[PDB]
Amino acid sequence: LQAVRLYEKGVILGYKRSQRNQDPNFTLISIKNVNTKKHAQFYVGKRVAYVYRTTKHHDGVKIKCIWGKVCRTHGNSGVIRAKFKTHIPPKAFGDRVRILMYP
Amino acid sequence: KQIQKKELQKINHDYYKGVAKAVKKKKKREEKKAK
Amino acid sequence: VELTEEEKLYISKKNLLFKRFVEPGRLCLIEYGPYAGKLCFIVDIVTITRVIVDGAFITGVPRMVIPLKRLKLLKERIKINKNCKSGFLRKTVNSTKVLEEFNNSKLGKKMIIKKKRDEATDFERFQVYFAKRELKKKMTTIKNKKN
Amino acid sequence: IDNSLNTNIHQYHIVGRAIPTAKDKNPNVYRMCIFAKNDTNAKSRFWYFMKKINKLKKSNGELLACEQIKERFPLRVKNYGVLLRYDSRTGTHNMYKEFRDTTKEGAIAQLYSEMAGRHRARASSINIIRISEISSSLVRRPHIKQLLKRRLRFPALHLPTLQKEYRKKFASKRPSTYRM
Amino acid sequence: MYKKEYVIDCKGHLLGRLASLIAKELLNGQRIVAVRCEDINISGSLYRNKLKYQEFLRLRTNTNPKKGPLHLREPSKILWRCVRGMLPHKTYKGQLALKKLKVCVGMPYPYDKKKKYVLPSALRAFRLKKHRRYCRLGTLSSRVGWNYDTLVKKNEVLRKQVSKAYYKKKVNNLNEKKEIKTEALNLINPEQRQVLENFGY
Amino acid sequence: KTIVSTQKVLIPEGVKVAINARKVTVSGKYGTLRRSFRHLPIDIRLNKLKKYIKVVMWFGVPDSLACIRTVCTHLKNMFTGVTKKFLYKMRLVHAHFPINSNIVDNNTRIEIRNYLGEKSVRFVKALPGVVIEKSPNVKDEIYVSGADIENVSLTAALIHQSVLCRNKDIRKFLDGIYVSEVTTV
Amino acid sequence: KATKEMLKIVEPYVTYGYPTLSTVRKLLYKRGYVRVGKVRRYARKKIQDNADISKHLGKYNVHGIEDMVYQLYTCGPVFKKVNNFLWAFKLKPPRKGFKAKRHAFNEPRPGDWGNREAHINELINRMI
RNA sequence: UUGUUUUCACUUUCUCCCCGCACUAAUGUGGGGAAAACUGGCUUUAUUUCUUCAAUUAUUUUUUUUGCUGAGGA
RNA sequence: UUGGAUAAGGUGCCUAAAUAUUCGCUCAUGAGAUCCCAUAAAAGGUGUUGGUUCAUAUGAACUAGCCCUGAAAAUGGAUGGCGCUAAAGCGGA
């Protein structure tokens, strides 16, 4: 009905990572319907918004967004690396991100 | 390039002939030795 | 030397567990690799796991060697010779119109409509949505009348 | 072309000769075709065999030719019999094995895989002697004999190998291995 | 992965593969519910798996077995423990992932009326060669001391009857709806018709 | 690994068979037998108008190929059992203590007494579809008959194994019940 | 003979081959750095110009990056001077990775060290 | 003490004949024989947009979508 | 410090990356699973797989891959754990 969507759903996995070591500069993101590197390449360069709610108002609003960009693919199974302006808090692992059709 | 193809065919033909001749001569040597 | 009604009836009703063998001329559909989604014809068998498939010059698959596990055999099979090559294969494929016959089966139609469905433009997507809306309206009217 | 399908064994024809000295003026020229990943490995194997059979080493020798033999008919299926010498964990043995495929290189790759899988014979322990096409009349191994029937057909009991795209995790209903 | 929760039917699924897939989904913050956990299959003979469980059973803390490895016998609990072992349960995030999983034997009241999914990557029919022995988790649990196998079978046949009735009713409804559609499809405008049959609707 | 291997079993005259998903059902004048072979990879081609059934296995390694003849022999045993009951003649041998056998429960649950003078009743219950009686010709003989070869043979084995002697020289104390012969009716 | 014998003792720790003209040229153009300062005070600088090549190597009539490429590809009369003037190339890791640095290139198993002959060019291209 | 030459034996059939004559995994089959020649191979003439013109190497020229960075202030 | 790309090693989950592709072998009623490294032998097997040499599709004798016996210790227990057999084992590519 109302509230059009025009973005793809993604899930925040961990940071860019090895065993026993983390690099919280890139966040791993999974796409709703991408399971290959070739398909994941389609979304490179798109802006991704992590929209989350706060307990109390901050600019008259209870919602705030952390912006980021899809930098490159990760692995062979359609996981991407995203770089945000500020590091994604590990509270957000498993949470939902908008990956928008623009640019 | 027909003459080139002919020339390149003959060298490979002769190489295979040499390989087959070696195979036959080693087989003959083994047959002679077996008895 | 001939058995007539009994042979025809029993052979027709035999209903084997395994049909669509790996004979030469069997029409298969590649489901893995760079050629996945394309049709081809088994021309000969090299090993138990490896075969040679020559999609004729009409299905965009070169005469190549493929592992058999990458194929999906379909109902169709043409009567090509075990020895025959690409040109005669194209001749006989066009003669028997096996490709046309495949593009009438449940699988063939499904692939055709899916292929022409994901190529739909935005306007075509809205067109099908609008048509479905009109159809749904008619459905509700006739269902309400059915009471 | 499918690189994942394609192995990288090739047949190389290599010709070499000892550097002429004062003792001998025209050394006999040694010629052999071998199988290797590339021409460099091919030359290395050629010099290894030169040293092993003849008393001729890389230092005292020179190359004369190194080319690649390509199969005349890469899409005709043919039967190959390959003689073989390999050493085990306790001895050295010769064996004769048969294959059938389009190219001698493919047959050799098959042989290497079979040796590794059956006798744990690493490639360093293998010496290929005399791979050659054999007619259907004198094929010896039953697993090749049964492939030359007048009309060969069998079912396709192999499991499906779908694309990674369609290899989805959650299925709506149980798929059938029965197929067809 | 992107649903509110995934209900999966564990019948004919290999225990370890199923647990691995489930654990990855849980770690990615996906809630799953595993039903019919007593029909999970395990590779290897029933005797071999029974021996493995006896070796597990012989294992308790000498000082005070209350603290020892709680062994558990319900196949649902066995699957739950396998998933936990496949999971970093000693951290906060791992604990959340573990608690996002629900396991049942049979199909209880909410889950017998929703779609059950299947992981083809863990189906016995696809992962085990037909000439090699396998085990049934329900019978293994019964031999170990679960003693609730037959009751689950009774409940399952009852659920089969009610599901059969529902399926017949649904099939009749779908047939009558298709009959409605094929006739109402003649009442729409011809160019709408062309679009619908061009795109296969 | 052979490509295809088959073996053919003729269907006798008085028997009717039905095979679906390697679940065979055999019916004859002496009852009905029902066997399942879902543990083997095989095609069972049943021909009715021309009799016979062919068991065919594709891509069989020798270990699996060994089962083709096993299945064929099982099928022909089913045929023979359903057309003429399998019969197992057993003999009761004793040195000094005659063995008192009593058949009760409409030719089932045979009871054995006086084995080595133990005056303690032993008994075995016949498997389903198996009939135990005593031979009307020889006094120390027992007939174990039925359609199912496995059932009747297992019942005979149960009779034999229920009466083994303990703590004595087995080769000197020969007494017991032994399968003298196996035939049909 | 001298350099070949020197290379022989270090063979298990290097890989080498025959560079060919295009890879020599692109090595010089993309990774070419040069020792500019007075002797033993060199101060590595990217080429970016022919001025310093002329300044140091001009007396051999080799002022120009193309002259350097020629003298390197063909073991020309001015080779030692050009090579010594050229700073050692600092290469990035291969794009697709190595096979196994532990084993020889000529070993039947995957390996990396030794003489690659003409196969050094494909490796340089992804190391560049 | 090397070349050179010769012999037979090599293929497809939805062909025909005989035997088992339905025996097959089979809408066929096993064994034994004939046939030409579609199939396959070769030789000519014209074409490569009906179709192919590959692969590798050397030698060159571009291109789609995009990540990060902007030292300095002559 | 910011990006990129790798080494060693890995890619079923724990754990970032293949339930990848391709070819064989193996069923273990104490399978096996990365140098150092965290034990295993002589001697056997009519388990199965592949070779070699003799005898009119049979009988033998060898050979060597995996598997099995040989193979018993004390708190409860460790291929790191879960587990894995159309491998997530072994040998390759």
What is the identity of the amino acid at D47?
W
How would you label F132-146 residue by residue, b for 16+ Cβ within 10 Å and e otherwise? bebeeeeebbbbbbb
Nearest alpha carbon to residue A100 among A76, A57, A62, A69: A69
| E118 secondary structure, DSSP code | B
CA atoms within 13 Å, Cβ hemisphere of F114: 11
Protein residue at shortest CA distance from C1' of H52: C57
Which residues, 6+ apart, have CB-to-CB distance to F169 below 8 Å?
A: none
Angle between helices F62-83 and F149-161 (to 10 degrees): 90
CB D121 within 8 A of CB D88: yes
Q: How far is CA D30 from the centre of its chain?
A: 22
CA atoms within 13 Å, Cβ hemisphere of G68: 28
CB-strand contact C49/H, under 7 Å: no
Of D159, D170, D173, the CB nearest to E119: D170
Nearest alpha carbon to residue A85 among A47, A56, A29: A47
Nearest CA-CA distance, residue A85 and chain E, Å = 23
D133 by Cβ neighbours in 10 Å (0-12 / 13-18 / 19+) ranks as exposed
Measured distance CA(F148)–CA(C56) in Å, rounded? 58
The two tokens of residue A27 are: 């966040």
CB E199 within 8 A of CB C128: yes
CB-strand contact D38/H, under 7 Å: no
CB atoms within 10 A of CB E139: 16
Q: Rounded to the nearest 10 degrees, how much is the dihedral formed by the CA atoms of F58, F64, F66, F69?
A: -50
The full 3-state SS of chain C, as one line of letters, equals CCCCHHHHHHHHCCCCCCCCCCCCCEEEEECCCCCCCCEEEEEEECCCCEEEECCCCCCCCCCEEEEHHHEEEEEEECCCCCCCCHHHHHHHHHHHCHHHHHCCCHHHHHHHHHHHHHCCCHHHHHHHHHHHHHHHHHHHHHHHHHC
Q: State how beta strands F122-124 and F108-113 pair.
A: antiparallel
What is the identity of the amino acid at D19?
I
Of C113, C120, C139, the CB nearest to E184: C139
- Look at the block and give the residue holding tokens 């990557």: E121
Which residues, 6+ apart, have CB-to-CB distance to E191 below 8 Å?
A: none
In Å, what is the separation between the CA of C87 and the C1' of H51? 9
The two tokens of residue G19 are: 């560079």
CB atoms within 10 A of CB E28: 18
Helices (H) and strands (E) in chain A, counts: 1, 6
CB C90 within 8 A of CB C80: no
CB A70 within 8 A of CB A44: yes
In Å, what is the separation between the CA of F69 and the C1' of I71? 38
- Look at the block and give the residue holding tokens 């080693």: B26
What is the identity of the amino acid at C136?
K
Q: State how beta strands F86-93 and F176-184 pair.
A: antiparallel
Measured distance CA(F143)–CA(D118) in Å, rounded? 54
Q: Where are the alpha helices (DSSP H) in chain F?
A: 62-83, 149-161
Of D4, D77, D161, the CB nearest to C44: D77
CA atoms within 13 Å, Cβ hemisphere of B12: 14
E29 contact A CB<8A? yes
**DSSP 3-state helix, strand, coil percentages of chain E (rounded to 5)?**
55, 10, 35
Measured distance CA(A75)–CA(A41) in Å, rounded? 11
| D108 secondary structure, DSSP code | H
Are the beta carbons of D5 and C33 separated by less than 8 Å?
Answer: yes
Nearest alpha carbon to residue E137 among E128, E146, E129, E125: E146
In Å, what is the separation between the CA of C147 and the C1' of H51? 63
| Full strand arrangement of the beta sheet holding D92-101 | D92-101, D78-87, D126-133
**Inter-chain contacts counted by CB atoms under 8 A, chains D and F:** 12
Which residues, 6+ apart, have CB-to-CB distance to E56 below 8 Å?
A: E69, E71
The two tokens of residue D156 are: 């396709």
Q: Where are the alpha helices (DSSP H) in chain D?
A: 39-53, 104-119, 142-145
CB atoms within 10 A of CB G42: 14
Which residues, 6+ apart, have CB-to-CB distance to E71 below 8 Å?
A: E56, E57
Nearest CA-CA distance, residue D106 and chain C, Å = 11
According to the entry, how was the structure determined? Answer: cryo-EM
E1 contact A CB<8A? yes
C75 to A57, C29, D105, F166: CA distances (angstroms) = 65, 11, 35, 67
Measured distance CA(C40)–CA(C57) in Å, rounded? 10
Measured distance CA(G50)–CA(G38) in Å, rounded? 17
Q: Is E55 helix (H, G, I), strand (E, B) or coil?
A: helix
Preceding peptide of A103 cis, ω within 30°: yes
F17 by Cβ neighbours in 10 Å (0-12 / 13-18 / 19+) ranks as buried
Are the beta carbons of E201 and C117 separated by less than 8 Å?
Answer: no
> Looking at beta carbons, which residues of chain D come within 8 Å of A35?
164-165, 167-168
Measured distance CA(E92)–CA(D47) in Å, rounded? 63
In sequence order, what DSSP letters do the residues of B1-35 get, joined into one string?
Answer: -HHHHHHHHHHHHHHHHHHHHHHHHHHHHHHHHH-
- Look at the block and give the residue holding tokens 């189906």: E123
CB E27 within 8 A of CB E87: yes
CB F155 within 8 A of CB F129: no
All chains having 3 or more CB pairs closer than 8 angstroms to chain C: D, E, F
Measured distance CA(G120)–CA(G17) in Å, rounded? 5
Q: Is D129 helix (H, G, I), strand (E, B) or coil?
A: strand
Are the beta carbons of D163 and C36 separated by less than 8 Å?
Answer: yes
C139 to C126, E181, G33: CA distances (angstroms) = 20, 6, 78
Nearest CA-CA distance, residue D25 and chain G, Å = 24
Nearest alpha carbon to residue F116 among F62, F83, F164: F164
CB D133 within 8 A of CB D79: yes
**Inter-chain contacts counted by CB atoms under 8 A, chains D and G:** 23
Are the beta carbons of C134 and E189 separated by less than 8 Å?
Answer: yes
Q: How far is CA E100 from the centre of its chain?
A: 15
D52 by Cβ neighbours in 10 Å (0-12 / 13-18 / 19+) ranks as exposed
All chains having 3 or more CB pairs closer than 8 angstroms to chain F: C, D, E
| D8 secondary structure, DSSP code | -
Q: What spatial distance separates the first Cα and last Cα of chain C, rounded to whole Å? A: 65
> Looking at beta carbons, which residues of chain C come within 8 Å of D100?
46-47
In Å, what is the separation between the CA of C10 and the C1' of H13? 27
B15 contact D CB<8A? yes
Give the angle subtended at the CA of F48 by the CAs of F44 and F54, to the nearest 5°. 25
Radius of gyration of chain A, Cα coordinates, nearest whole angstrom = 14
What is the identity of the amino acid at D116?
A
CB atoms within 10 A of CB E62: 6
The two tokens of residue F94 are: 């004793």
Q: Is E49 helix (H, G, I), strand (E, B) or coil?
A: helix
Which residues, 6+ apart, have CB-to-CB distance to F161 below 8 Å?
A: none
CB G65 within 8 A of CB G21: no
The two tokens of residue G17 are: 């081959």
Backbone angles phi, psi at D43, to 5 degrees: -65, -40
Q: Where are the alpha helices (DSSP H) in G32-85?
A: 51-57, 65-73, 80-85
Which residues, 6+ apart, have CB-to-CB distance to E64 below 8 Å?
A: none
Q: What is the H or E stretch that residue E25 is in?
A: helix E15-27
Radius of gyration of chain D, Cα coordinates, nearest whole angstrom = 22
CA atoms within 13 Å, Cβ hemisphere of F23: 2
Are the beta carbons of D77 and C66 separated by less than 8 Å?
Answer: no
Question: Strand I nucleotides below 7 A of a protein CB?
Answer: 2-9, 12-25, 27-31, 47-54, 63-66, 75-77, 81-88, 90-93
Measured distance CA(C134)–CA(E193) in Å, rounded? 10
Residue of D nearest to G118 (CA): D40
Find the discontinuities in chain F where C to next N exceeds 2.5 angstroms and give the residue preceding each: none
> Looking at beta carbons, which residues of chain C come within 8 Å of D179?
72
CB G105 within 8 A of CB G113: yes
- Look at the block and give the residue holding tokens 């290395």: D44
Give the angle subtended at the CA of G22 by the CAs of G16 and G28, to the nearest 5°. 75
Nearest alpha carbon to residue F58 among C91, D156, E53: D156
What is the identity of the amino acid at D16?
G
Protein residue at shortest CA distance from C1' of H40: C83
Q: Is D64 helix (H, G, I), strand (E, B) or coil?
A: strand
Q: State how beta strands G33-34 and G45-46 pair.
A: antiparallel
Q: Is A36 helix (H, G, I), strand (E, B) or coil?
A: coil
Which of F4, F22, F45, F65 is best to mutate for the D interface (most D CBs within 10 A)? F4
All chains having 3 or more CB pairs closer than 8 angstroms to chain G: D
> Looking at beta carbons, which residues of chain C come within 8 Å of E198?
116
In sequence order, what DSSP letters do the residues of F4-26 get, joined into one string?
Answer: EEEEEE---TT-EEEESSSEEEE
Are the beta carbons of C134 and E181 separated by less than 8 Å?
Answer: no
Q: Which of residues 132-161 of D touch F (CB under 8 A)?
A: 143, 146-147, 152, 154-155, 157
Measured distance CA(D114)–CA(D156) in Å, rounded? 23
CB F6 within 8 A of CB F69: no
- Look at the block and give the residue holding tokens 């398909």: A39
